[PDB]
Design an enzyme around this catalytic site. Structure first.
Site, PDB file in Angstrom:
ATOM      1  N   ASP C  24       0.780  -1.226   0.000  1.00 25.42           N
ATOM      2  CA  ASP C  24       0.000   0.000   0.000  1.00 25.42           C
ATOM      3  C   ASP C  24       0.817   1.284   0.000  1.00 25.42           C
ATOM      4  OD1 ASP C  24      -2.341   1.647   0.334  1.00 25.42           O
ATOM      5  OD2 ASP C  24      -3.213   0.049   1.584  1.00 25.42           O
ATOM      6  N   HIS C  57      -4.725   5.889   3.129  1.00 21.79           N
ATOM      7  CA  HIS C  57      -5.233   4.655   2.535  1.00 21.79           C
ATOM      8  C   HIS C  57      -4.694   3.423   3.278  1.00 21.79           C
ATOM      9  CE1 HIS C  57      -5.474   1.481  -0.687  1.00 21.79           C
ATOM     10  NE2 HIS C  57      -6.676   2.021  -0.826  1.00 21.79           N
ATOM     11  N   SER C 217     -10.990  -2.160  -1.831  1.00 13.03           N
ATOM     12  CA  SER C 217      -9.879  -2.495  -0.922  1.00 13.03           C
ATOM     13  C   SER C 217     -10.382  -2.739   0.512  1.00 13.03           C
ATOM     14  CB  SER C 217      -8.852  -1.377  -0.874  1.00 13.03           C
ATOM     15  OG  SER C 217      -8.176  -1.239  -2.109  1.00 13.03           O
TER      16      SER C 217
END
Ligand SMILES: [Ca+2]
Lengths: 92, 15, 472
Positions: C24, C57, C217
């Site tokens: 990520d 994120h 995700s």
């Protein structure tokens, strides 16, 4: 026999960087020699190339920064399976 | 919720 | 007080040695949700950008997987790789190197079952798909996001990658996440759905802050946590065994199909992931469409440790010449034939049957089709070339292909229901649907397929035939 692949989604393509994939049984020593061969043949043609990474463990092969002009040459290198132009990935 | 940190949404209420 | 998503994945009856890797953005590793359970590898391969934004994120997803309060697998240990830059953009080459890094780590310092979460997507990539397959064949579990473009997941990578677990997103109403032209990807490359809208998790804004995020995700992160937990209970699971459990424990038929394009409703699994509560497993595998030749054939395959117990076919127009089960590379495969004739789908039923061998008996609609002892009939396939009794397969001019299994600890029963656009017959509770077919009648059948334990026959009388099995 060796094929070329580039991302179908045009805004996602990263021309100038290529993943050169070799045939599955290729030993790490051959991947390095094939990459040096490319560099040398490129040099003879007035092209600068940069080997960013040599792959081993999952797939044999290497990452090269060079002009697309060299693809026809790189596709003729020994042990080459296919070459793929680098492309973008995004957080989903 | 939707945040722009996740491609490719802008800031929007979710839920 | 329990976030909707965590309640949603809790089964109706309910009551570590696994490592989860995350590819990520940067991670805020000291956030109270995940501090002490996430190890930052300091592997970094990202393209240049064209600060609290940088790790939003990744931090949120680490939290969904293993967060103390809002995590799925609260006691899960993680390792992170940085492959997405501050704008959440990465490269295929960067991801390849990260995946290679995971493999080299494992060779150097072996641990237990490994779950790799890939909360990212690009266009279809031969090399990324190949790398994932090799990593999976090496024994690693990969969980990926289906993608957020309200599109066929088969067009994206690693979502389309064979052997990876591909996850789509649903919301609190169990409906597919949509936001105008954006929303969850769908189709035959998606294995299942999981909560992916309004998912509360760690915010990298402050060490104790929380934010709600949406995405395939977030949905994939729920599956990685369920997967991590399942491997803790059964560390010896193969990828195929983990997939069959995920499917088997999922909530079924809760998504309202109407949101997907018409041609994709059959192909898209109607599954919302759930944890197990503290056997014969079967799954349905659809092929790519055959195309419009008269000699066109669609092929549906099982995993190496799976048995092909049945094989059916489907054409929207109805112009088809059935299907057959045939051995390819020492493995039974499902092959469907197009009639003159836009094309067909091959639909396999793949099951986990140890203390099982299975063989195909090709004969005309021959009176018993599994003539052997203690042998059970698990499926009846049928094909013809013109275009116009638990152990026996009924047909009209057609050639029959019978799947015959030797499984001493197994009982099978055949249920028929005859009546129109759709007829269904379901196996009873405790029974697993192994075979699904239609009997020829005064209606032109478009085909048959298994939806979980329900046999569906589509036609333009009509009778559905389900073979149901269970251990005893
Ligand atoms: Ca998949």
């Amino acid at each position: 026999t060796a094929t070329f692949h580039r991302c179908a989604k045009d805004p996602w393509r990263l021309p100038g960087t290529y993943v050169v994939v070799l045939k599955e049984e290729t030993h790490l020593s051959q991947s390095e020699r094939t990459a040096r061969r490319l560099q040398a043949q490129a040099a003879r043609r007035g092209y600068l190339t940069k080997i960013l990474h040599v792959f081993h463990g999952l797939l044999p092969g290497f990452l090269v920064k060079m002009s697309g002009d060299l693809l026809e040459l790189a596709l003729k290198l020994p042990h080459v399976d296919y070459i793929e132009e680098d492309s973008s990935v995004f957080a989903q | 919720x939707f945040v722009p940190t996740t491609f490719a949404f802008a800031e929007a209420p979710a839920x | 007080s329990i976030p909707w998503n965590l309640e949603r994945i809790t089964p109706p009856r309910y009551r570590s040695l696994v490592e989860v890797y995350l590819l990520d953005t940067s991670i805020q590793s000291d956030h109270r949700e995940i501090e002490g359970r996430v190890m930052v590898t300091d592997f970094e391969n990202v393209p240049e950008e064209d600060a609290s934004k940088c790790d939003s994120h990744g931090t949120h997803l680490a939290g969904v997987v293993s967060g103390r309060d809002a995590g799925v697998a609260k006691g899960a240990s993680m390792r992170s790789l940085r492959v997405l830059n501050c704008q959440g953009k990465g490269t295929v080459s960067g991801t390849l190197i990260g995946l290679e890094f995971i493999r080299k780590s494992q060779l150097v310092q072996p641990v237990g079952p490994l779950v790799v979460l890939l909360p990212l997507a690009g266009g279809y990539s031969r090399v990324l798909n190949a790398a994932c397959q090799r990593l999976a064949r090496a024994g690693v579990v990969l969980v990926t996001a289906a993608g957020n473009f309200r599109d066929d997941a088969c067009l994206y990578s690693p979502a389309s990658a064979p052997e990876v677990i591909t996850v789509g997103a649903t919301n609190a109403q169990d409906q597919p996440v949509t936001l105008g032209t954006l929303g969850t990807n769908f189709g035959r490359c998606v294995d299942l759905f999981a909560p992916g809208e309004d998912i509360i998790g760690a915010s990298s804004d402050c060490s104790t802050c929380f934010v709600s995020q949406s995405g395939t995700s977030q949905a994939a992160a729920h599956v990685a946590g369920i997967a991590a937990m399942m491997l803790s209970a059964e560390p010896e699971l193969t990828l195929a065994e983990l997939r069959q459990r995920l499917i088997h424990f999922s909530a079924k038929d809760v998504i309202n199909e109407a949101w997907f394009p018409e041609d994709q409703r059959v192909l898209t699994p109607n599954l919302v992931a759930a944890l197990p509560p503290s056997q014969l497993f079967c799954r349905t595998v659809w092929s790519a469409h055959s195309g419009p030749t008269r000699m066109a054939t669609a092929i549906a395959r099982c995993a190496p440790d799976e048995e092909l117990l049945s094989c059916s076919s489907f054409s929207r127009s109805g112009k088809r010449r059935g299907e057959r089960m045939e051995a390819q590379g020492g493995k039974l495969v499902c092959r469907a034939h197009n009639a003159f004739g836009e094309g067909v789908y091959a639909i396999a039923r793949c099951c986990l049957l140890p203390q099982a061998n299975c063989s195909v008996h090709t004969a005309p609609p021959t009176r018993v089709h599994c003539h052997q002892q203690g042998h059970v009939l698990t499926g009846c396939s049928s094909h013809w070339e013109v275009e116009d009794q638990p152990n026996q397969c009924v047909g009209h001019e057609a050639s029959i292909h019978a799947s015959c299994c030797h499984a001493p600890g197994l009982e099978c029963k055949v249920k028929e229901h005859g009546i129109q656009e759709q007829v269904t017959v379901a196996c009873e509770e405790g029974w697993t649907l192994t075979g699904c077919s239609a009997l020829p009648g005064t209606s032109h059948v478009l085909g048959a397929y298994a939806v979980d334990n329900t046999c569906v026959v589509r036609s333009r009388a009509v009778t559905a035939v389900a073979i149901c099995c269970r251990s005893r």
